[PDB]
Design a protein around this ligand. Structure first.
Ligand SMILES: CCCCCCCCCC(=O)OC[C@H](COP(=O)([O-])OCCN)OC(=O)CCCCCCCCC
Ligand SMILES: CCCN(CCC)S(=O)(=O)c1ccc(C(=O)O)cc1
Lengths: 488, 165, 95
């Protein structure tokens, strides 16, 4: 029986999702004796293959109910393992972790999409001995001193498969946890192996974009008044073709990412800025063929965006690529809040200084007063007792009021930013850079919109046991003195 | 070694009578006085402060400089291209210098009356100012987050190593 | 016998340096009973003067394997001292 009404569905209100079935309730409430009874009573045994209204099996239900705390996750890991070990008795021919819900997700793929690092790490690295060895995803090949060599099973994991765990973490997962998931084994060595095969394609793509931005600059400089002339025309055609090429390449990106489009740009803001630079490059050449002089401010905007977009490629090296992650932060969220306070001050004082500076015994218009009042924040204030104005003492008191209120506001704003951002949290920039390299790899593996690359398959087909049990395994070698010495 | 090479080179260029001896003599005069800060290690108070002050800032400013120079050059080629049409910014050097003056507080931010695209030139300056001051705010907060950690001050011992060397 | 192939050398990849000798392995794996047996069995006593391919003795091997953590360093200090104290029995003229 499925408890399927809105109280039992997963949503932001008052609810309790446990799956929908008696067996999934008994698992999520941590009742082995009830789970054992429901599974192996003679009257009506609970099928481990049974699914709720979302298609979730009890293993998807346990992944939905995992929280990344040590008390929940350790007990969900035990509940998951004993149900999987009971599946090997009760359903011996059935691969319970190959059962897909209505989103096409297995329990491992669902743990990646929902960002559940603790149960994800456990499933991904799972190892057993004796009867349950085929339920492993990790097989130790040999161990010697501080060194372990392990084969990891890549079945749902390698990006050779469509809708794989790597594609999910990069493009379908919403969570803060994505950068912690790409730095787990085997994913860390597997993404390094892919990156090493593609780093020459990454820097070729950068060198083409440097040559395009050199030509863009040499043609935006050397514009005529509004052999050198035919080379200028060639430069405009190369910019049109580079602008159409980038416009088609980014429309293909957003077409492929359509179902999860916000997830595919929330951190990856350059995928919008390359589309915008390409649109403005095509629009500026179109306005130039129309001969309208508004082509030049579009060409110059797409030249600025063109060089700002060159900062995308700083992720290719650890030192620049981690710093591009250290620098950009929570400041973008709070400056957009401070800007509302700063613009009510700036406009409120601008309409006032304009109204009062109108009478004779700067400040000529709302734009000019907004600009003179804005110059106080760049240190160019021009603060003076204006001799010709009738109300010159009140105009000076309005400037002294604006200065004091604005510098109190900037002092409040800097101290508010320090209070949230200088917290001592250990720096998570290396792992956010590893996720930027993962997103870059998983895009490069498709080739280009015009030349769609045939994907190479990672690891080797190896016999790990008797199901024989032959799997695409990937060999990781770990050296760990600090963990090993504690076992001596 | 550099101050000594430039001192020998500047006297060699002076014996050659080439007027480029003077900018080498003046560079080796600057380095000459900067090198006088070596001897601050002879006393505990100046010698520990020479160790408090120099730090991880030299590593991260060389990373920020790549971001700042892509902004500065990207906006300089743009303001030069757009300020070319009549109804500052005469060359890549002059626009790089006018845009650099915004970081020393000497910005000269204005609605230029004679330029055809003067509103777009002002919007390009307001875009550069806002992006650069967001970048400097990100850079200062990034530096505080690594360098204000509460680690107990290891300057007395780094000064003892300077005295050992 | 010297375990001297690249897995046993010290480098930035996958490796396990212990010196290269049975006695240096027994010391770095913290096995006094094996260290005592290798040093003072009657069949073939391990020379405390014996060296790997870098010329490292067991005392250089223990210095290579020290980490500045309190658990590693305290146990390396005990392993180093007992080998040095055994050198005063087994190699009494040798510094
Ligand atoms: C259609 C058939 C003809 C194909 C011609 C060759 C295409 C090469 C494509 C390539 O190198 O693109 C690099 C860059 C986009 O970078 P990105 O997709 O990695 O990252 C995008 C951001 N996510 O895009 C560019 O630099 C623009 C390409 C045009 C300029 C080529 C200059 C060549 C100089 C040697
Ligand atoms: C490829 C050689 C591997 N070796 C260690 C490297 C020197 S090994 O000593 O042969 C060995 C060690 C341990 C195990 C095991 O734990 O199953 C098996 C083999």
């Amino acid at each position: 029986l499925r408890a399927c009404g809105r109280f039992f569905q997963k949503h932001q209100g008052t609810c309790f999702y446990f799956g929908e079935l008696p067996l999934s309730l008994a698992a999520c409430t941590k009742q082995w004796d009830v789970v054992t009874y429901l599974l192996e009573n003679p009257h009506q045994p609970a099928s481990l293959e049974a699914t709720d209204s979302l298609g979730n099996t009890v293993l998807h239900a346990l992944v939905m109910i995992a929280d990344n705390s040590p008390e929940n996750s350790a007990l969900v890991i035990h509940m998951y393992d004993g149900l999987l070990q009971m599946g090997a008795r009760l359903c011996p021919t059935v691969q319970l972790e190959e059962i897909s819900n209505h989103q096409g997700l297995t329990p491992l793929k669902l743990a990646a999409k929902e960002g559940k690092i603790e149960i994800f790490r456990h499933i991904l690295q799972r190892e057993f001995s004796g009867p349950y060895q085929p339920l492993s995803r990790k097989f130790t090949e040999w161990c010697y001193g501080p060194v372990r060599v392990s084969l990891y099973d890549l079945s749902s994991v390698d990006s050779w498969e469509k809708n794989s765990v790597l594609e999910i973490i990069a493009f379908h997962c919403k969570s803060p946890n994505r950068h912690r998931m790409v730095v787990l084994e085997p994913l860390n060595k597997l993404l390094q192996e892919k990156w090493d095969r593609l780093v020459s394609r990454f820097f070729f793509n950068f060198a083409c974009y440097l040559v395009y931005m050199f030509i863009f600059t040499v043609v935006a400089y050397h514009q005529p008044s509004l052999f050198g002339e035919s080379m200028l025309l060639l430069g405009h055609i190369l910019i049109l073709l580079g602008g159409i090429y980038l416009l088609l390449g980014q429309l293909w990106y957003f077409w492929r990412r359509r179902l999860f489009i916000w997830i595919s740009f929330m951190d990856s803001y350059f995928e919008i800025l390359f589309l915008l630079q390409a649109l403005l490059t095509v629009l500026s050449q179109v306005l130039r063929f129309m001969e309208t002089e508004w082509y030049l401010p579009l060409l110059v905007l797409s030249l600025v965006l063109g060089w700002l977009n060159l900062l995308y490629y700083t992720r290719g090296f650890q030192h620049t690529g981690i710093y591009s992650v250290m620098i950009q932060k929570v400041i973008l969220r709070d400056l957009l809040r401070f800007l509302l306070v700063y613009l009510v001050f700036l406009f409120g004082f601008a309409v006032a200084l304009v109204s009062l500076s109108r009478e004779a015994r700067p400040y000529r218009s709302i734009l000019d007063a907004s600009l003179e009042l804005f110059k106080f924040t760049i240190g160019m204030g021009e603060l003076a007792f204006q001799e010709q104005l009738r109300f010159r003492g009140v105009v000076l008191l309005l400037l002294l009021a604006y200065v004091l209120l604005t510098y109190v506001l900037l002092l409040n704003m800097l101290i508010a930013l320090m209070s949230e951002t200088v917290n001592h949290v250990a720096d998570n920039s290396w792992s956010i850079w590893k996720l930027q390299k993962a997103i870059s790899v998983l895009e490069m593996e498709n080739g280009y919109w015009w030349c769609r690359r045939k994907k190479h398959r990672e690891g080797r087909l190896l016999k790990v046991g008797t199901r024989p049990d032959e799997r695409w395994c990937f060999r990781v070698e770990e050296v760990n003195w600090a963990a090993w010495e504690k076992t001596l």
